[PDB]
Amino acid sequence: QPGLAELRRRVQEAGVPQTPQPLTDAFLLRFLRARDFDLDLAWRLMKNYYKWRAECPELSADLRPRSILGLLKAGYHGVLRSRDSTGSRVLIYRIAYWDPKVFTAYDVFRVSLITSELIVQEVETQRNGVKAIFDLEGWQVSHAFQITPSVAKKIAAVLTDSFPLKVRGIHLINEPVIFHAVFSMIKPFLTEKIKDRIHLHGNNYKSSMLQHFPDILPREYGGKEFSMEDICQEWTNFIMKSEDYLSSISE
């Protein structure tokens, strides 16, 4: 790979912490692939990733799952069994299974960080990226109370050059009108390729979702072969089985 050992010379001569993430070839590949081996942006992303980590100890330091197990058990999150036509990983998040009384927005954010770290190891996921589907049915004001400006800036960074993962699609379903109306305002001021990656489907999402993701959705969203229950429990399994590797890369 053009820049496999080349990039490590920038890593050594800068003084990047060797722990908790061992600076292996397997770890350094994440950053190059995440920018299509553009060595220049790969280095900015690596700096931004560790900058993001040093800025957020309450989030980035701890990847140990046992703390957000209740959320996974409640069925907040599952990853689809298959990749989409572009080979991207497809993730589903379900707002109605987040209890703001029990779990804070930072706990919920950790779930994405955990999943992101496990799937980023997959080569195809590095090349093809991820698409994320947010089912906003069950949105309460108590959820909104949790999304402070500080939380929103962290969502922003992690989706744009602060994590070694291409975001290839953000899909919202069952959003409140208020979400769609505000987004309508910010939409025209966004770049051309970015507003091609954000999709607000509303309540009548059936067919737009099938255009984007044929054959691979759970029954709840128009598919025919499995349910959210299945993939949630499956993904919950994968995370708890990987809890040791997750511990070994924590602080």
Ligand X SMILES: Cc1c(C)c2c(c(C)c1O)CC[C@@](C)(CCC[C@H](C)CCC[C@H](C)CCCC(C)C)O2
Ligand Y SMILES: CCCC(=O)OC[C@H](COP(=O)(O)O[C@H]1[C@H](O)[C@@H](OP(=O)(O)O)[C@H](OP(=O)(O)O)[C@@H](OP(=O)(O)O)[C@H]1O)O[C@H](O)CCC
Ligand Z SMILES: CCCC(=O)OC[C@H](COP(=O)(O)O[C@@H]1[C@H](O)[C@H](O)[C@@H](OP(=O)(O)O)[C@H](OP(=O)(O)O)[C@H]1O)OC(=O)CCC
Is 194 one of the binding residues for ligand Y (CB under 6 A)? yes
Dig out the tokens for 78 from the structure.
Answer: 């599952």
99 by DSSP, 3-state: which?
coil
Min dist CB 150 to its own copies, Å, is 5
Stretch that binds ligand Y, among 72-80, 142-150, 234-242, 243-251 (CB under 6 A): 142-150
**What is the distance between the alpha carbons of residues 144 and 191, in angstroms, rounded to a whole number?**
27
Subset of residues 134 to 153 that bind ligand Z, contact rule: CB under 6 A: 144-145, 148-150
Residue 40 in contact with ligand Y, rule: CB under 6 A: no
219 binds ligand Z (CB under 6 A): no
Nearest approach, Cβ of residue 172 and ligand X (Å) = 6
Cβ atoms of 251 and 61 closer than 8 Å: yes
Q: With CB cut-offs between 5 and 8 Å by kind, which of ligand Y, ligand X, ligand Z, none does residue 144 bind?
A: ligand Z
Q: Is 166 in the site for ligand Y (CB under 6 A)?
A: yes
* Distance from C-alpha of 52 to C-alpha of 225, rounded to nearest angstrom: 39
Q: Which is nearer to its own copies, 119 or 151 (CB)?
A: 151
What does the block give as tokens for 161? 């050059």
- Give the 3-state secondary structure percentages of the chain, helix then strand then coil, rounded to 5: 55, 10, 35
113, 59 contact by CB (below 8 A): yes
- Determine if 245 is a binding residue for ligand Z (CB under 6 A): no
Taking alpha carbons only, the member of 250, 232, 241 closest to residue 98 is: 232
Annotated binding site for (+)-alpha-tocopherol: 163
Residues in contact with ligand Y by CB under 6 A are: 129, 148-150, 166, 168, 184, 187, 191-194
Annotated binding site: 161, 163, 166-168, 184-187, 193, 197
